[PDB]
Amino acid sequence: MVLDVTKDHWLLYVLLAQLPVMVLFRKDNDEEAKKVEYIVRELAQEFDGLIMVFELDTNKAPEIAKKYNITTTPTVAFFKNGEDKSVLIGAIPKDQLRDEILKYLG
Ligand SMILES: [Cu+2]
Structure with a gap:
């Protein structure tokens, strides 16, 4: 789903989220x-x-992309216990994204 909240409300949600969070940072203009994009929706x-799962166009919320130092898209960021624990950048295979998800389920 699209990230639609303020940077402050996003940071607050991340603090309070009781299950893992995965954010696609996209722009994207790239094949x-x-x-x-599609793999993450799947x-x-x-x-x-x-x-x-959230998707964020980095030019409609550059303050959010800025807090996480997103310099290039696509970037997938994983969140647990209120902060970003890991990032996969670029042409990430689907099975590697899946495996990151599965490690944060534990
Ligand atoms: Cu508020």
């Missing part, structure tokens, strides 16, 4: 980028109820 549907 590799739209494949990561995983959101697959792990519906187990993780929260």
